[PDB]
Every structure is written in structure tokens, then in C-alpha cells.
Amino acid sequence: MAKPIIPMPRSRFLRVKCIDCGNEQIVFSHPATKVRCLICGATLVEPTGGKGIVKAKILEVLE
Amino acid sequence: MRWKWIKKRIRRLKRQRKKERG
Amino acid sequence: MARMHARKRGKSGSKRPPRTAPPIWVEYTVEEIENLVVKLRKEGYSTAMIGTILRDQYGIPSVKLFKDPDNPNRNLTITRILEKHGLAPEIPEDLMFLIRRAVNLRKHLEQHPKDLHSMRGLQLIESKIRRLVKYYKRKGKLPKNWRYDPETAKLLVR
Amino acid sequence: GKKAPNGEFAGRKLKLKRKKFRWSDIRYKRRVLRLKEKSDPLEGAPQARGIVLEKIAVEAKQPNSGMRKAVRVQLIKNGKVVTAFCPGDGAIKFIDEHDEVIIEGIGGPKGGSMGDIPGIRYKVVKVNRVSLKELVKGRKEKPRR
Amino acid sequence: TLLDPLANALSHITNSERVGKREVYIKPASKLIGEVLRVMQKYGYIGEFEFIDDGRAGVYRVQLLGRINKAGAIKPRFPVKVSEFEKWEKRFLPAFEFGILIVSTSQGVMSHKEAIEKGIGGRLIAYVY
RNA sequence: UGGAGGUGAUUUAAAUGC
RNA sequence: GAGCCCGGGCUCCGUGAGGGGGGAGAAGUCGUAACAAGGUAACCGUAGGGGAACCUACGGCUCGAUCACCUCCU
RNA sequence: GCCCGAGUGGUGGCCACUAUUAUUGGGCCUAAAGCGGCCGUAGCCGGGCCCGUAAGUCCCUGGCGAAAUCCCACGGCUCAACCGUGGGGCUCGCUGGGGAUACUGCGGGCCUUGGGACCGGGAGAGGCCGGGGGUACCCCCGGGGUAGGGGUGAAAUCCUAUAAUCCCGGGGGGACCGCCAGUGGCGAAGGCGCCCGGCUGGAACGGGUCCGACGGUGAGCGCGGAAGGCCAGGGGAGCGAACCGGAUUAGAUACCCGGGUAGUCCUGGCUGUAAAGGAUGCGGGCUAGGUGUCGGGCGAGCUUCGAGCUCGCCCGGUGCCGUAGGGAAGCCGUUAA
RNA sequence: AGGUAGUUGGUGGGGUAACGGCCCACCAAGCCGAAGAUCGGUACGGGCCGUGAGAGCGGGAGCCCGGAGAUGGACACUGAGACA
């Protein structure tokens, strides 16, 4: 890693735009849990190992 | 060796401890 | 980094964001954040998981950085947001989760007593409680009159 | 940490450690109790007079054989039986039975009889308050009673 | 856990030295070490350092000239009178020339030689030579 | 080129010496 | 309010039949135990048995055996 | 001839040598020596950042630690020893006042690197409980089938003639789970292995999401601990201390062979030992590398579309080889010695 | 490895040159201990002394300083002062 030369996680941010309601959500590239859309009740991502596996096609802007 | 000694020590102990018990 | 406690195994290297002031591409008011927290503590979720869902859904990695400064005595974060409202459990969650689990063990052993290993973690979880108790007394979340026992663990849970 | 506590207030642990571990020196232990002083008669002393009960000769050790001259003397106040090694060639002669014989040690009080002699802890200096090395030389004085 | 974070800095710094790397990284960081490296730099033993304060920790990246032979902390950290200095002078240091028996003092922190010129003393902290 | 196991193992070869 | 005495209990010093072991002496006897796979590998904790060294059982260990047979490793 | 010289030598004691008592200044794989492993009490030891006190701590002053002895000067006795005068030190363990605030203590505040804690994916001989299958050995019954078999270097004792071994069919019992199986995994340790399900311990990783120094270690103390043994109850195929025969042998209380009890299994309890080893206490930090391997993550290619087959970086573990260094050497060497 | 019964403290009192469980009447149940008490051994204590590069270790001799004793053990007078 870089524990003595400043450890920074692997992370990033990405704007996810829902395909069922057009709802714009901020999502941590590593979903630990099931993230639920706040105006669909859908599942955007499912938590597995490392980076949450995104369920099916949902739009993405990478920050 | 230490077989020997352990049983010798034990026999000494018993026999003598027999003589003390008696 | 590690501590192999009741283990020989190096600990996870999970590490914080080295962000010291918060993202502004992420946006929430002191008022909006406070609502989100109160809603989640109303569900039955607990502060670690409250910080978890907020992270995964609303994109706030830790509350302290976003919130404070809004009363710069100290950092404002989940349970310090809760205590000002009165939603805080008087037992620290740390100590609670611990004891919670513990009472479940006992019931297993109750029915099954031929269990080395299961017996041996009873001994391994109590003794973390003991510690966690000991220091709190002196810090003051739990009165000095208390002392820990398995009947005084079955009373706190019920 | 190579053993020891190091820390301001710990010292006491140090202080007891040493002492605890001092008693593995046989010599130190022995003196500090006084086992040197109690066991190997004398009551500790430099020397002791005693009455020559008889004269006895014993054998030499392992690579060796030769008749060492030894007395049996009884220390008088000590009241203990001591067998003893006599210096010199002719000697056993100049010592009459029931003359006074002053006795010493010989070669470390540890117990160590010299390499040849098995038992003998001790030495003789004297016959009727005149010594043996004075009686190996003819001129110096010659014995009585 | 750790204790003596300083020492675990220093000890790296020397074992760092003995290899002959170029620069160092010390993951735990502080005043003690900060200050000590400061005084160390002041005498010159080391080149330049930057610390970056991460929200975790201070880290010091240190530049190694080649000068340092040996530089170590003191174990119980004994108090030392200004009369007893000479004893502790002969023991730890390699000779009269060097004079960074770094102590901590009423005035601040100093080496041995900077302590003696003022005239003030106390408990020992570390050494450098 | 140098190291670790798992199992066949061989009775046709006899006590002592300062 | 001493020394003194008396009856009992407990402890310590001088000294005693008898009894235990040590470091030995190495010319008698029994055996070959270990050290070479010591000629049944050896040790080990435990248990029984044998005159003795010791043997055997069960579990362990290699500070384990010699090729052979099979398996891995720079 | 050498030493020393009115001395020189013997015995005894103490100190030195002896870093053979380790503060200065010792070790503990194999030389003596790690507790079989863990827990936490007493103790010692403690991440960063700010403020108060100034208890330790340093600085200055002041009260004081008799004389003597010691060390230095000068002076006195012919000289010195010895003494006189002047200066210093002295167990030196005490006290009063002022001053500093780095460190340490204490008090208060503040923070997430340590610790703990959570969520989701994941492997395994971890434990317990219930369930269930098959192997082989034995036993018992019917059939078939005769002159042996068993055992050894040779033999005997012993199996078999109301029939053994053997083969076929049927039934009953207790133990255990080859290959799988790995230089493999899990466990604190003793240790742990058919398959399935329930209950349950630990562990890894991604994200530090929460607590905010809560830490380390650990005398005492408490707890777990193979096999053997013991206790009470139940069970008993094979095996098998003791034991009973044969052989061997000069003799054999043996190695080899044929019987055989305790025990080995189950339940409850006790007992607590080992070459309980990696002969290597635990925790943190630092210090070339290489390779194989197990599990988790990641970027790709392949794909049977399952991380199934591979490349590399990373994290945790498990081996081997080896630079610097250490070691007496063997060896150890990012799983440190 | 647990010890302690005037034993720790309280009130009031006696006695003493004088404070004080010193002693005593009443009341209370403390006091001391693993930061090793109690018990057992050994031993006058200090200034110093010996040794050792130092750190340290051993030692209490003349002499000085302070305490204890006078055949063992108890006891008062007389005197400022003695239990001599």
C-alpha cells in the first residue's frame, strides 16, 4: 500500500442516475450494503467482495 | 537411564514410604 | 497496525479517507444531515450501521468532518447528534453489543454442555466486557456501584 | 526487554531480584548463613590444639600409593574426632601419642583435601608446642615427653 | 502497543542509517521526535525533513547525509544533575568532541554541548553521535 | 543441485579385555 | 513486687544401639543395557512385571535408524 | 641461579580477578536455563495535540550533615611517618524561600495512527447435538465342499473330523471412516479428519461506518490440558500391560508365533503429567530479496459464462532458499536466533 | 501468612517532672498485614574502615560520637541528678 508514505484508500465517488425513476444518487464505489433508491425502492448495487457489484445497467458519471 | 532412575526413585520412595507408613 | 488478540493473525488494513475537510461536490446542510440521522435511529439501526447507510446512500464518509464546525467545542457526529435529542442509549453501544451477544451464548451452553470451544469464548467475551466496564466507570457512562456478573448481564438485556 | 524492568519506580523489583538470585552462589549463601563456620569443626578458627589419640597411616588415591602420615587428634573444646595429615618425611616419629598437637587446615577450607589425600582437610604444625618443620632440621629443637 | 515512539523513530533512523538508504519514513510522529529531529538538524546530523500531518498521523520523511553513527533513547530516562553530566558524558558518548547527549531541560531541549554552555539539566531523553 | 515426509524392511554375522 | 518453687505442655544443646545415601577403591560374579540400526532404533510421560542391567503396553518425539519404494522443494 | 629483603613463607577469612550476580555490565534453539497455553488483579511500562498546577525534575539562594580519617597546599619535627595552619570532599538519608515548565506526575480539554466495535461477501479435519451409509474384521445360522489348517529360521503349544480353512446365501455385534489427502487447512494449547442438517467458537477481506488511548505485559489468582492411571455406572469386535504356552537362546523373566485381563469405546467425575518442540514467552517499530503454496481483494485474457484456466500488484497465513547482520559452529536470517 | 484483647480508638479520670492505654473506669470495634506484617535467625548503631578504575561488595578493631551493662535476677533510700 502506502501506510508510511500516506495511506489513501482505493476509493472514489461516482454519480449514479437511476434507470427506473431518473433519481440522481451519490454512491461510494464500494457498496457495503444494499443501497436503496429513495424514489423507487429498487436496488442500485448489491454488496459482495471489494466493489459492490452493480445490479444490471444503471447510468454512471465517474467523479 | 531415566526409566531406570524413575523407578529406582519410585521404589526407594515406596519401600521407604512403606517403612514410614509403618 | 495489527493485533493478534486471541489470534496469531494480522488484522485488516482497512483505512480512513485522508480527507480533513469534507467534499463539496457532496452537499447537505446541518439541518438535513440531522434529519437523516434521526430517521435511521428511529428504524432500530445502530450508530455504526447508521454511519454505514449514510455513507453508502448519501455519500458522507464520517459525520465529524462535514458537521463541525457548527459548534466547534468538538466534532459533531451521530451519537453526539443523538444525545442532544435524548435518543442515545445510556449504555454505550460498544458495551451494549458486547453484552447483548453474550447472553445468547449462555443459552446454547445451557442445553449443550460438552463444549470446549463454546465454553472458551464465554471466557473470551466476558473479559472484554470487564475491561470495557472498568474504564467506563472512571469515564462515567456506568455508575461505580455496578459490578459485572451473569445475572447482572441477564437483567440489562431484559 | 532484556530482563529487567526499567522504569522509575520499579526498582524494588530489581532490589529483590538480585538478592533472590544471589543465593545461587554457594559460597555467598554459605557464609551469609554461616555454614562454613558451623560444620567443619574449629568453630571457624585459624587453628586448634588437640590430644593425639593414636597414629594411623592410610593409603593414597587413584594413580597413586604411598603411606601418608596421619594422626588422629581430638580437639579439646571442640571435642571432635579429627584425622589429620602430617607434613615432612620421618615425622611420625617426633609425635608421641598423648602430646599436644595443634592443627590447622590445608589448601582452601572448601573441604578439599589436596589431590593425593582423600579425607584430610587439615594439617599439623606442632608437637609439644614446637613445630614439625623445626623437627625435620636436627639442630633447631628436639622433642620431650 | 507502542511506547517510547521517539525511540521507535530513532531506532529506525539508525537502522535506516546502517543500511544506507537515502531517506526515511517514520509513520508515528510527534513533538518529541519532531523537536528532537529539530535539535538534530540544528547540530546538522541530518539533512532536511518534511512532516505531512495526515488525519491519521504525522509522518516524517527525513534526508540522510551519512553523518550519523548511533543515536538512541534512554531506557528509564534517568534524571541527571549538572555535576553528574561528566559521568554520563564518559559512558554513553564516543568522546569529548561529539556532545549530543540530548537531554530535556528547563530552558527547552538541547544537546549535551548546548546544555553545558547554558548551565542547566534534568532527565535524560536520548543520544546522538 | 541440495532438503522433508508415508513403509517394506535385513537376520545369513555370538559376551569379554587390566 | 524479683528470685525462688511445684505440676503439666512445647522446644533446644551434649551424647546413643541401630539405620540411608554420596564421591570412591577398582583383581572377584552375573549379564550386554547404551554408545555403530550396539545386532529388538533410541529417548520420552505413564502403568505393570523381572535378580540385575532391563522388558513390555499405550501415547508422543527425533536429538530416527540403512538402502529400497512412493510423494514434494530451489 | 632468580625473587625479595629484616623480612619471607604456611593455614584461615574478606575483596579483587569473577560482566561466576550483570545499575555500569550476563544469559536462556542445540552449552545451565521458556512456565505445556491463556486470562486478567497488584505492579511496572504508555500515540498526538492545547491549557493549569510545578508534586518529581533542573537552577539559585538560605538553614545544616561535630572533630578525626581521606585528598591538595604551605608550615613544624634532621627526614618522612605524625602533627599544626589553610582549602576541599565526605553517609551525606533532612528543611525554608525564590525561579524555570522540556520531560514526568496530577487536573482539565481536545483527536483518531493503537485497541475495541459494525455491515456485507468467504474457506476450513474448530466444538456440541440430531440424523444417516458403507468397508473390512469377528461372531452365529443354512447350504456347498474334504484332510487340513495355524504357526516358524526351523519348530512346538495350539485351530480342525459332529467337518475347520475355503466358497455361496442369510442374520447379529462393536470399532472405525483407506484412496480422498496436498511441501494442504483449522485451532491458544492439548489437539482436530465419512456424508447431511441444526445450534455454536474463532478467523480472513473490502469499507475505518461507530467509540475516542479505553493500551501492553503480567507476581498473586483463575481456567483449558494427549496418553496412561483412578473412581461409579454401561459396554466390549479387534487389539492388547499383566498373565498362560511354544520357540529362540548357554540360560530368556525378550525380540518372533498362539491364546489373554485390566484398558482401549460411551456417560459423569477425578487426576494434571510429557522430547506438552519450532527444545525458540508475549507486544510494538525498524532492517536485500527470490520462490512455492492456502484463503481474501483488485486489473485482464481465456470461458464450459462457474473466478472454471492463467498473468501481476496487494492483504492475511502457511514452507523452502538466501543479502546485510548475528552465532561457537550447525544454522538463523521480514514466520529473527 | 494471617497477627493483635490494654489490643486500635473514644469519654472521663489517675499517676508522673511531663504528653501519652503510661495506668484505670465506662464505651466502641477497631488496629496491623503480599509496597511482606507477625514469627524465627543474626547482629550494638554511627563517624569510618578494607578492598575495588569506577560502580559495588564486605566490615563495626584502637580512637571519637551515642546507647546498653556491672556474677544471673529483682528492689528502694539518699541526693539536682542513681535504682548506683
Curated annotation (Swiss-Prot), chain A:
Binds 1 zinc ion per subunit. Pfam families: Ribosomal_S27e. The keyword DNA damage does not apply. Keywords: Metal-binding, Ribonucleoprotein, Ribosomal protein, Zinc, Zinc-finger. Its cofactor is Zn(2+). InterPro entries: Ribosomal_eS27, Ribosomal_eS27_Zn-bd_dom_sf, Ribosomal_zn-bd. Zn(2+) binds at residues 18, 21, 37, 40. This is Small ribosomal subunit protein eS27. It comes from Pyrococcus abyssi (strain GE5 / Orsay).
Swiss-Prot record, chain C:
The keyword Ribonucleoprotein applies. One of its GO terms (cellular component) is cytosolic small ribosomal subunit. GO terms for molecular function: small ribosomal subunit rRNA binding; structural constituent of ribosome. Residues 1-21 are annotated as: Disordered. One of its GO terms (biological process) is translation. Pfam families: Ribosomal_S13_N, Ribosomal_S15. PROSITE patterns: RIBOSOMAL_S15 (PS00362). Keywords: Ribonucleoprotein, Ribosomal protein. Residues 1-18 have a biased composition (Basic residues). CDD domains: Ribosomal_S15p_S13e. Part of the 30S ribosomal subunit. NCBIfam families: PRK08561.1. HAMAP family: Ribosomal_uS15_A. Belongs to the universal ribosomal protein uS15 family. This is Small ribosomal subunit protein uS15. The gene is rps15.
Curated annotation (Swiss-Prot), chain D:
One of its GO terms (biological process) is translation. GO terms for cellular component: small ribosomal subunit. Belongs to the universal ribosomal protein uS12 family. Part of the 30S ribosomal subunit. Keywords: Ribonucleoprotein, Ribosomal protein, RNA-binding, rRNA-binding. GO terms for molecular function: rRNA binding; structural constituent of ribosome. This is Small ribosomal subunit protein uS12. It holds the Pfam family Ribosom_S12_S23. With S4 and S5 plays an important role in translational accuracy. Located at the interface of the 30S and 50S subunits.
Curated annotation (Swiss-Prot), chain E:
Keywords: Ribonucleoprotein, Ribosomal protein, RNA-binding, rRNA-binding. InterPro entries: Ribosomal_uS8, Ribosomal_uS8_CS, Ribosomal_uS8_sf. One of its GO terms (cellular component) is ribosome. GO terms for molecular function: rRNA binding; structural constituent of ribosome. One of its GO terms (biological process) is translation. Gene3D superfamilies: 3.30.1370.30, 3.30.1490.10. Disulfide bonds: none annotated. PROSITE patterns: RIBOSOMAL_S8. Belongs to the universal ribosomal protein uS8 family. Part of the 30S ribosomal subunit. HAMAP family: Ribosomal_uS8_A. One of the primary rRNA binding proteins, it binds directly to 16S rRNA central domain where it helps coordinate assembly of the platform of the 30S subunit. This is Small ribosomal subunit protein uS8. It comes from Pyrococcus abyssi (strain GE5 / Orsay).
